[PDB]
Design a binder for these strands. Structure first.
Ligand SMILES: [Zn+2]
Ligand SMILES: [Zn+2]
Lengths: 197, 197
DNA sequence: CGGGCATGCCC
DNA sequence: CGGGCATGCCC
């Protein structure tokens, strides 16, 4: 019984995929996504819109869960949590949770009783009409560099689509780097990929 | 009734002054003192020997107190304390105290009931015989850069010599920078002083 | 807003 | 051990 959740992409029978908005070119843009690295660069405590795309409409009662895990093998089995500084100076969200959802009246924050991992869950809502996706506003409450938290360790966010019975319907993931200057750090990484990847 | 303790040098009638040991040239020497800047550069949680020199022998019951205060006017009135990370992962010393004394069976840690400032106190002991000074081993439990603690703000350590009745007998102070590479940072600062001081 | 320095750590 | 990069922030 592993305590490390799968990160394997599983688009499933509903054709579940993630979308991200294009952003500005600014050195310190608040949120920016790199398709080449499948990686979000964003600033702490600010909005990161993630779009949910499906080919088929999930059944009523379907839920959307987000959870962070460390990306490197050496840190994979350690629970991702808020650093003690940002925990201390911290409504519904427990202070130890890294990932929050804003703008949803039905958000649930879970602390797994066996694996101790944190996750945040909202109801899946189908797009309104004309629209092809549904947007969730996530918030990361620490910088990747936070001492006693992520401590410079890369993380993945895993988004899972789950029915009310608990069956996995779909899964996707993206890397996240919460940092002061997302535009600078995105360009630096893409350039490093080009020259020495 | 101010809550900012004096840092003014007061050598007093006993001729109280501080001494510091000369150290190596290494980039990451554990402790090194700059006479030009009256400034200690040291690594966290490691020994910083400070020598006490007097011209006249203090009376029995004399105490030696150390306390940190922020050096800049803008931060002067804020209590210097341990960051929440190093407080959490922390015998006699309360976890919130930045400055500890090692190797003394009579150490007292005080949290002032009116000003809320932290200090650590030991008995003054006169030099043994032949020696001209007495050494106290101090420990700083955070880096200057610790988020939620010093947060990159320069500090002074104020050493006061006090009689058992509480009269101030002498006072001296030095700046402290707790950092990963004290030798590098000392040379950088002395060079900056030379070129643009 | 982008340039550029200080500083912890690389693996 | 010293060189040198990443990254938060300068004031
Ligand atoms: Zn944090
Ligand atoms: Zn600290």
């Amino acid at each position: 019984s592993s305590s490390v959740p799968s990160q394997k992409t599983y688009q499933g029978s509903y054709g579940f995929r993630l979308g991200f908005l294009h952003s500005g070119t600014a050195k310190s843009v608040t949120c920016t996504y790199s398709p080449a690295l499948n990686k979000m660069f964003c600033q702490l405590a600010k909005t990161c819109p993630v779009q949910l795309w499906v080919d088929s409409t999930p059944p009523p009662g379907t839920r959307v869960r987000a959870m962070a895990i460390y990306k490197q093998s050496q840190h994979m089995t350690e629970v991702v949590r808020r650093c003690p500084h940002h925990e201390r100076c911290s409504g519904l969200a427990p202070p130890q949770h890294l990932i929050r959802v804003e703008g949803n009246l039905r958000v649930e924050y879970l602390d797994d009783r066996n694996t101790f991992r944190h996750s945040v869950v909202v109801p899946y809502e189908p797009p309104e009409v004309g629209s092809d996706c549904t947007t969730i506003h996530y918030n990361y409450m620490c910088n990747r560099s936070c001492m006693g938290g992520m401590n410079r360790r890369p993380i993945l966010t895993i988004i899972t689509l789950e029915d009310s019975s608990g069956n996995l319907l779909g899964r996707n993931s993206f890397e996240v780097c919460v940092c002061a200057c997302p535009g600078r750090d995105r360009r630096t990484e893409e350039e490093n990929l080009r020259k020495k990847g």
